Amino acid sequence: YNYLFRLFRKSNLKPFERDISTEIYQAGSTPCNGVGFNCYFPLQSYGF
Amino acid sequence: VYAWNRKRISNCVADYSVLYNSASFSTFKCYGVSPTKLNDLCFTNVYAD
Incomplete structure (x- = not known):
């Protein structure tokens, strides 16, 4: 999990x-307040 | 789950935003295609299981 890519x-x-x-x-169309459903951390991992 | 109901979706306009903008779900995901792009794409057939 040490390698990542931007998904969005x-x-x-x-x-x-x-x-x-x-x-x-x-x-x-949801207010995310910088913090869940429709409010994702955009960096994700391949898990090689 | 041993005998899932399949619906065939055809001859119609599909507003996927009524799904992906709704807070009504404990999880929503799409694979190979972005959900916001499903409001532009058109298909010969669609299926719901």
Whole structure:
């Protein structure tokens, strides 16, 4: 679980863009308050 | 669970947002396709088990 990728973002990356952000991702029409259902941590692991 | 009911979904418009925006579920997931993209995609058949 030491390797991760970003599963979601508010818009697609530009060429050679980099984004370290750990901010919570709002997956639908729900207020997430920076903290659950439709309110996910956007970094996820392959579990190789 | 030994005898699941299957519904065949066809000839209709499918508002998946009524599912994915609803807080009515203990878990919701989609695989190979993003749920917000299912409001754009169109299919020959759909099935619900």
